[PDB]
Design a protein around this ligand. Sequence first.
Ligand SMILES: Nc1ncnc2c1ncn2[C@@H]1O[C@H](COP(=O)(O)OP(=O)(O)O)[C@@H](O)[C@H]1O
Ligand SMILES: Nc1ncnc2c1ncn2[C@@H]1O[C@H](COP(=O)(O)OP(=O)(O)O)[C@@H](O)[C@H]1O
Ligand SMILES: Nc1ncnc2c1ncn2[C@@H]1O[C@H](COP(=O)(O)OS(=O)(=O)O)[C@@H](O)[C@H]1O
Lengths: 203, 200
Amino acid sequence: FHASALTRSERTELRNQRGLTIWLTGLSASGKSTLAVELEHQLVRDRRVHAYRLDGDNIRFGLNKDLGFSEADRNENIRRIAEVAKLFADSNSIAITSFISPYRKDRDTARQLHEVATPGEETGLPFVEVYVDVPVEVAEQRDPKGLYKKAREGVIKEFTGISAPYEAPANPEVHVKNYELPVQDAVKQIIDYLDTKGYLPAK
Amino acid sequence: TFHASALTRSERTELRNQRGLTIWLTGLSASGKSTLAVELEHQLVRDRRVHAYRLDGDNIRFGLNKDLGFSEADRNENIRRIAEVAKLFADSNSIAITSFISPYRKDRDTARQLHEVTGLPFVEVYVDVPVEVAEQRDPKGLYKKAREGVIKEFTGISAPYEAPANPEVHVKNYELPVQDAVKQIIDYLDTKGYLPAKKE
Ligand SMILES: Nc1ncnc2c1ncn2[C@@H]1O[C@H](COP(=O)(O)OP(=O)(O)O)[C@@H](O)[C@H]1O
Ligand SMILES: Nc1ncnc2c1ncn2[C@@H]1O[C@H](COP(=O)(O)OP(=O)(O)O)[C@@H](O)[C@H]1O
Ligand SMILES: Nc1ncnc2c1ncn2[C@@H]1O[C@H](COP(=O)(O)OS(=O)(=O)O)[C@@H](O)[C@H]1O
């Protein structure tokens, strides 16, 4: 019987794909969730790989149902999400996250956790920071849930882009100017990048 | 010309060619949980060709749960988080394999309902050895430290272990080859049709 756990190399070959994390960041209504859902469809369906999205829906009322909006809780929220994305990446799955993650330190913390060697290997796992970029005016014109309106009326306290800052990434792996660009083209810009790094199986 | 709705379990199941579920190991320190987890993961990924992942002390205690100490509020939290992570894995159509002592019936029960509450299968595996067997293995000298009071509230010595009354799989993991134990688990999984067809 095997006494040593599967190595990244054995798992990579046996699962026939690599593991990495795709981290979307951008204003509310920039389209993070929209790109994540379609990106996941193509990866699993079109590319035949294991990919899984982490977002408010499966995190907020589960793993992080105990976190509020305090500085401490906001940091812990990001920390936990990052550790989880890392576990999926370590299992040779492609984790896709779509949290506003407004602060540079939010993404730095997630990147660092991924970029540090894993128990056994000499390297970490790829962390692909995708800036889903739209001017605030574009986000406000979308405002599907009315959040911006309620943000400009204090109904919502400190809202990214309105009463709290969004710190734009200077050097994201993928910068998607997600406006006046069809969703299919934006998702393609992402998949095309992944292919240039050979992060995906043939096709 | 794009998907507005996220992949459904049914579709992810078709596309991934496997079901997702959580195999929860529970038992005393040195009962053999990691050994079983490692070999089980090898067999599921290699021989059965599926996506499975072990959640053990290694990748959890120093990462996601590094902030957790030992107050009971902490041991409950440790278990709760692990259960939620296992569920996400099952939801992704992966077979999560967790190996934590998880001494309290309450925690395992809470973990289970998190899954069964349509829903994900939760296969509770009791990796059972009487305490004298675990204490004679004591590969890391933890039992010796517990006996000397160097480690307090040590499961099975100075803290309780609530054995599962009706676990899906009961492994009498003593004077038993690891291969036979893993086979017991995998065979149970096939009786439930949880795995794709065996490779020819
Ligand atoms: N490339 C795009 N072109 C036009 N509309 C888009 C595009 N991407 C996203 N949207 C639209 O913008 C709104 C916000 O998208 P959403 O995914 O909910 O954003 P976020 O997850 O960043 O809050 C939705 O109405 C969505 O359909
Ligand atoms: N079936 C077995 N028979 C005899 N020894 C075993 C068996 N399974 C595991 N062990 C031994 O027992 C020790 C504890 O196993 P381990 O898997 O680390 O336990 P646990 O993870 O439950 O604390 C190890 O030294 C291992 O080699
Ligand atoms: N007080 C303690 N009780 C039990 N295990 C302990 C204790 N202190 C340290 N350990 C170590 O931590 C492992 C148990 O950790 P877990 O499996 O994560 O336990 S659980 O109860 O929270 O599920 C044991 O194998 C042992 O190496």
